[PDB]
From a paper:
MutLs, with a few exceptions, are endonucleases that incise the error-containing (i.e., newly synthesized) strand of the mismatched duplex. Prokaryotic MutL endonucleases and the endonuclease subunits of eukaryotic MutL homologs include two domains: the N-terminal ATPase domain and the C-terminal endonuclease domain (CTD). The dimerization subdomain contains the metal-binding sites, in which multiple zinc ions are coordinated by the residues from highly conserved motifs: DQHAX2EX4E, ACR, and CPHGRP (underlined residues coordinate the zinc ions). Here, we solved the crystal structure of the endonuclease domain of Aquifex aeolicus MutL in the manganese- or cadmium-bound form, revealing that these metals compete with zinc at the same sites.
In order to explore this possibility, we performed crystal structure analysis of the aqMutL CTD complexed with manganese ions. The aqMutL CTD, which is purified as the zinc-bound form, was incubated with the buffer solution containing 2 mM manganese ion at 70°C for 24 h. The protein was concentrated and crystallized in the presence of a 50 mM manganese ion. The crystal structure was solved with manganese single-wavelength anomalous dispersion phasing. Peaks of electron density in the anomalous diffraction map calculated from data collected at a wavelength of 1.8900 Å were clearly observed at the M1, M2, and M3 sites of the aqMutL CTD at 100% occupancy. The overall structure of the manganese-bound form was almost identical to that of the zinc-bound form; the root-mean-square deviation between the two structures was 0.1 Å. No peak of electron density in the anomalous diffraction map was observed around Asp351 of the DQHAX2EX4E motif. Thus, it was confirmed that manganese ions bind to the same sites of aqMutL as zinc ions. The electron density of the guanidino group of Arg406 was also missing in the manganese-bound form of the aqMutL CTD. Likewise, the position of the α4 helix, the structure of Arg406, and the quaternary structure of the manganese-bound form were the same as those in the zinc-bound form (respectively).
Residue numbers in the entry:
A (entry chain A), B (entry chain A): 0, 325 to 425
Write the structure that this text describes.
């Protein structure tokens, strides 16, 4: 993610939607917080058990915190178990489908 | 779209994001209103020129109206010029990427 981004909100109490000028990202809130905790604690079991789970509503402030920290992780791509932290769609795929330039 | 859906908001002042249990839809606000106006007026030039354009902010109420009407169109799929009204992503593609069942 570029430094300039827009948080669109939570989906299914599971993903944080955030976009920059290139992609829309669907960030798994559990995998992100597990990665945040794992880089601090260096213990994957502890990081997992203390992190938020899917199905929990998050406040706007909590969402802001997580996304800000995400950009500074050493590994913002995969959790300690190797699962992708996010799904991404290039914005151009959305624009081109409806016949718009991007 | 199924009758039960969740509007997630506007993106880039261009798309309305709305999901049901199967897909997340990115609905082009101009193409949707052009389709609404075209089915009423039966004039594609008039329908186009009176419809909202990309880049206009829409109120929550206006967004609700458009999405409610979208589901009742005779052709909710393509505008009178044949451009797809929306892009869609199966929710399972997002969930499966992060290792979740859906
Ligand atoms: Mn441990
Ligand atoms: Mn875990
Ligand atoms: Mn675990
Ligand atoms: Mn803050
Ligand atoms: Mn993990
Ligand atoms: Mn493409
Ligand atoms: Mn005319
Ligand atoms: Mn038009
Ligand atoms: Mn036109
Ligand atoms: Mn209303
Ligand atoms: Mn058209
Ligand atoms: Mn698939």
């Amino acid at each position: 993610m570029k430094p300039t981004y827009e948080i669109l909100g939570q989906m299914d109490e599971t993903f944080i939607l955030v976009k920059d000028s290139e992609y829309l990202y669907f960030v798994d809130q559990h995998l992100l917080e597990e990665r945040i905790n794992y880089e601090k604690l260096k213990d994957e079991n502890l990081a997992c058990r203390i992190s938020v789970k899917a199905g929990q509503k998050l406040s706007e402030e909590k969402i802001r915190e997580l996304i800000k920290t995400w950009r500074n992780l050493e590994n913002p791509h995969v959790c300690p178990h190797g699962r992708p932290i996010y799904y991404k769609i290039p914005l151009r795929e959305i624009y081109e489908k409806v016949g718009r330039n991007y």
